[PDB]
């Protein structure tokens, strides 16, 4: 359940560590963002020398959520923090070449095949 | 809302309702019959009948629990000595409610609540 002003960590290695969500894509009055939902974020805390800098605005995807996902059988998979992976505003493709931490099987799709492969663990 | 719930506030908080029910149960054990409002006489059964079933099995832990609930040694002793064997054959139904009528000061319903084995 990600919304505006939500502070997220960064799973990739593009040079960011803390980001702030500003919009959720999908339609009108769209307030909640789960895993696999494209959102738009700004960068608040970034490493000195990285692929991005502070103040940049770009799209991102959610791979981990403290609220968690719900499998059809009822088995809910939660986490201990909210993390996201950066993308591009035009191509919607990841910037970094690594994915820290595990991911969820509710993320795999023709658009995110480059995230599950780089993730060391898939749930 | 109130759906499938239990218990009656009786315009009192928990710390007052528990003490009032404890005093009423002690008086009922001491006198074998009392007169009170109908809702109180109905809610006192849920406190006194389990207290009698506890005394139906004599031991140390049961007497300690009854003392914790009542704070009256002269009441718990009578409950474990007389009421125990007296109601050892009855599977519940240790109280009998008889309507008394009304009251003058507030015109509230009144009733006598007593033990079935009294006379």
């Amino acid at each position: 359940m990600i919304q505006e002003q939500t502070m997220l960590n960064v799973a990739d290695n593009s040079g960011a560590r803390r980001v702030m969500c500003i919009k959720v894509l999908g339609g009108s009055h769209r307030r909640y963002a789960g895993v696999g939902d494209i959102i738009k974020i700004t960068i608040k805390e970034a490493i000195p020398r990285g692929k991005v800098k502070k103040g940049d605005v770009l799209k991102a995807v959610v791979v981990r959520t403290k609220k968690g996902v719900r499998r059809p059988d009822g088995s809910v998979i939660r986490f201990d923090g909210n993390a996201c992976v950066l993308l591009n505003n035009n191509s919607e493709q990841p910037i970094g070449t690594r994915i820290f931490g595990p991911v969820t099987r509710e993320l795999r799709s023709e658009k995110f095949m480059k995230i599950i492969s780089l993730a060391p663990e898939v749930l | 809302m109130r759906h499938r719930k239990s218990g009656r506030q009786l315009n009192r908080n928990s710390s007052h309702r528990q003490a009032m029910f404890r005093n009423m149960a002690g008086s009922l054990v001491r006198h074998e019959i009392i007169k009170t409002t109908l809702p109180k006489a109905k809610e006192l059964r849920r406190v006194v009948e389990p207290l009698i079933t506890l005394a139906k099995t004599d031991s140390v832990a049961n007497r300690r629990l009854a003392f914790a609930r009542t704070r009256d040694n002269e009441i718990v002793a009578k409950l474990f000595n007389e009421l125990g064997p007296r109601f050892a054959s009855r599977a519940g139904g240790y109280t009998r409610i008889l309507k008394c009528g009304f009251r003058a000061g507030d015109n509230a319903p009144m009733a006598y609540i007593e033990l079935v084995d009294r006379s």
Binding site: - | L98, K99, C100, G101, Y112, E114, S119
Partner: protein, 54 residues
């Protein structure tokens, strides 16, 4: 919030029509005492269903 015109005795009586009282439909008689008491209640002497409790 106050009235602007004085109501009438007709309207007052119409409002008070539902404020009447309903008497007791019937009384109960003890089998052995022959008194008259309320339904499911005890008499003034201590009788109920013929038995004595006071």
């Amino acid at each position: 919030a106050v009235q602007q015109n004085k109501p009438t005795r007709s309207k007052r009586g119409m409002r008070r029509s539902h404020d009447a009282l309903t008497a007791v439909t019937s009384l109960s008689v003890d089998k052995t005492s022959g008194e008259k008491h309320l339904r499911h209640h005890i008499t003034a002497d201590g009788y109920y269903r013929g038995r004595k409790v006071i």
